[PDB]
């Protein structure tokens, strides 16, 4: 009912991802009735939109084994769109694409140990020659070169974000090998899928933050000013910083983070300077979101705070908040676990006049969180997350994350005598057999703690 | 059952130390079936691992009076490995060893009074010539030179940590004699063997600190992030600082110590600078442990603390704690005796989210502590430590150490009339007859005090 904004809605170009028959990195497959519906001729360059603001440029072909409302794509495309089989994507016509001037690609380190020879000659030139490949900045793609397969990252493009790779296109692969951990910490990046039992609130955040920035026309047309300060509150560990990260990674808006302790750690004046620099930066760049994490650090009750610099900072913030005129298109978000210790002046009309309660999850919410946490964990058949969800009454998201960590440590302990602290590497068999059992969860449960 | 991590595990190369028949400083003996099992030819340079991260480089020879699962080595090697007869050691092949360029040795002061002549000519040259001795940095070795025996320390080596001493190797013995007290305070250095009634907690520390740094692959494979802030707490004098010292000496990780009062003693800003320098240093150096001792000195509850500089430090620490990304491989340990006075922000998820209670010892634990303290004391037959353990209901390790000191002072008092405060030296006979009796302990017990 209120949750209406979160609903996906069926569109002509909103398609479910299926596994590819054509395993080329540049190709996506559609049924023939769907291509006619979208006015897409064979071999047209297309723009695909995934999760977490991710994109890929592909060339579209007709497939008969494919269903009407499905799209076929390999792992390389699915990775670049940060999607798994079954997820929905947008498909857009893309006749805009310029021919490429200069591109800069680099190999992922762990897929490139032993023999350089020439990376352009062995791998890249046979991959691109006469292929007229569409590529996007930040694409990770795989190329076989007889012997084995090397993954490459598109670092730069001379036509703005995406281009077609023609014979003209100078292919550079100059610098050091791109680190594996960097790109794995990039897949790590928090999206809305990584936040559990918070549906009602994510709906509220998209209403108050995402909707007025992307569509200011709506609010201006109806005759209403968009609320400009949203304050997330709730007990420690409920998911506020997580939502902050999600929003940062999910929004069309420019995002600026301010950490409370990070500001208060600075020299007198140099902190007030960074607060100003934040707001000037947000004003300068697009529709924008300013996220003040741990607000109570910077803005406690002026009445009960000893230092002059500390009182000056709260005043600096209040001024900035009223300093944005309507036409700035800047929303300030803030998170706290002690809302009652914030200066009431900041919670007045026009400032942080809207509150989102990120409270304690219910039994249903906890199950989501457990499913989110264990999505990379090796679990046994006998693990019942429904059972764990019910036995975890007072638990919030942080408590559940800890529970899963201790369940895993227990499984490591059960494998201890086949492991020693002294040897350089752990045995390969021991690594594979590692599964977290329900027994492990019950041991974690017996140790667990509220609030 | 949980304690599984502490268990030693039998290995082909894990051997018991027996007394040597071959009394050379460079030589270790093994049975012939064991040499074949480890693929060790006669006269191969080997690396031995002892207690408290200590090592020796030896040359291996076959012995027939030696058992299969035993190793023979003299006092000098045992000293260098900080092991006594019966302790287990690792043995490793070592064919890496370069020929030495320059070494720097120095004599131990008390073993060098009267006649210099030439230390290199009389002692060192005949010890090394055509012998191709393996030596490690930090080795203390004894050499006879007709008249008497002088102990020398290896201060420096031009091939990194260890080298072979060939005729090529320039032998320097330039500087001042190394002080006896320096090397006895180096034998003094704390290891896990010096910490009593803390088995459960030592196992926890190895799980949360040692395991994820030496084997990050386990936690990454199972799909779990390693906890990154461990907080030791308990009453005054239970052994927190003692464990701190033990870990520092026992770990494969680079270790950085921060003392609370040592930071708070510094000028405004220059304290925040050392904190950053500590974290930047730990990040720069390997897998690392940062130990913040007496954390309550640096991080009290921001709500109830007067100084602006004092509030700024807590903020500085929080920022550093969060500043470490997962892939830093740095664990922060901290100790306190008033956990309830630390800012709660620091005890949240991702910060100091794990706790180890170093509590009051039980009757069994007290016995361990008394055995650890008295290992260098001269005791009598009638001294029953089990009796003393039972009569010490409220006592913690610090109280037990003090109890032992006062028992010993009593034994000195019993010997008083044969001693006087005015004479330059104490009589030789009086020194040897000094034993701490049971009666002394009952006197110590009558004086003792709780908490
Ligand atoms: N609703 C949630 N869904 C999924 N994971 C969660 C959720 N809440 C917490 N977690 C996990 O717990 C961790 C810590 O939660 P945070 O987002 O830091 O809590 P917080 O609300 O910011 O707490 P405070 O107020 O800063 S102490 C996250 O990194 C997640 O792994
Ligand atoms: N569990 C123990 N095992 C062996 N010796 C101990 C133990 N606890 C205390 N001691 C002895 O008592 C001395 C003082 O203990 P510390 O390690 O300083 O205690 P602490 O827990 O650091 O106390 P705080 O919190 O700094 S007041 C040590 O040097 C040891 O000699
Ligand atoms: Mg938070
Ligand atoms: Mg201490």
From Swiss-Prot, chains A, B:
Residues found modified as N6,N6,N6-trimethyllysine: 304
Record key words, sorted: Acetylation, Amyotrophic lateral sclerosis, ATP-binding, Autophagy, Charcot-Marie-Tooth disease, Cytoplasm, Disease variant, DNA damage, DNA repair, Endoplasmic reticulum, Hydrolase, Isopeptide bond, Lipid-binding, Methylation, Neurodegeneration, Neuropathy, Nucleotide-binding, Nucleus, Phosphoprotein, Transport, Ubl conjugation, Ubl conjugation pathway
The keyword Hydrolase is annotated on this UniProt entry: yes
Function: Necessary for the fragmentation of Golgi stacks during mitosis and for their reassembly after mitosis. Involved in the formation of the transitional endoplasmic reticulum (tER). The transfer of membranes from the endoplasmic reticulum to the Golgi apparatus occurs via 50-70 nm transition vesicles which derive from part-rough, part-smooth transitional elements of the endoplasmic reticulum (tER). Vesicle budding from the tER is an ATP-dependent process.
Annotated phenotype, changing residue 144 to H: In FTDALS6 and IBMPFD1; properly assembles into a hexameric structure; cultured cells expressing the mutant protein show a marked general increase in the level of ubiquitin-conjugated proteins and impaired protein degradation through the endoplasmic reticulum-associated degradation (ERAD) pathway; shows strongly reduced affinity for ADP and increased affinity for ATP; shows normal ATPase activity according to PubMed:16321991 while according to PubMed:25878907 and PubMed:25125609 shows increased ATPase activity; no defect in ubiquitin-dependent protein degradation by the proteasome; impaired autophagic function; defective maturation of ubiquitin-containing autophagosomes; decreased interaction with CAV1 and UBXN6; decreased endosome to lysosome transport via multivesicular body sorting pathway of CAV1; decreases the arsenite-induced stress granules (SGs) clearance process
Catalytic activity line of the entry: ATP + H2O = ADP + phosphate + H(+)
Enzyme class: hydrolase
Effect recorded for residue 306 to A: Does not affect methylation by VCPKMT
Protein name: Transitional endoplasmic reticulum ATPase
Post-translational modification: Phosphorylated by tyrosine kinases in response to T-cell antigen receptor activation. Phosphorylated in mitotic cells.
Molecular function as annotated in GO: ADP binding; ATP binding; ATP hydrolysis activity; BAT3 complex binding; deubiquitinase activator activity; identical protein binding; K48-linked polyubiquitin modification-dependent protein binding; lipid binding
Effect ascribed to mutating residue 144 to S: In IBMPFD1; impaired autophagic function
Record's comment describing the protein's domains: The PIM (PUB-interaction motif) motif mediates interaction with the PUB domain of RNF31.
Residues with PTM Phosphothreonine: 425
Effect of residue 303 to A: Does not affect methylation by VCPKMT
Effect of residue 294 to Q: Defect in ubiquitin-dependent protein degradation by the proteasome
Phenotype upon changing residue 187 to W: In IBMPFD1; increased ATPase activity; impaired autophagic function
Gene (UniProt): VCP
Species this chain originates from: Homo sapiens
Effect ascribed to mutating residue 99 to A: Abolishes interaction with NPLOC4
Domain of life where this protein originates: Eukaryota
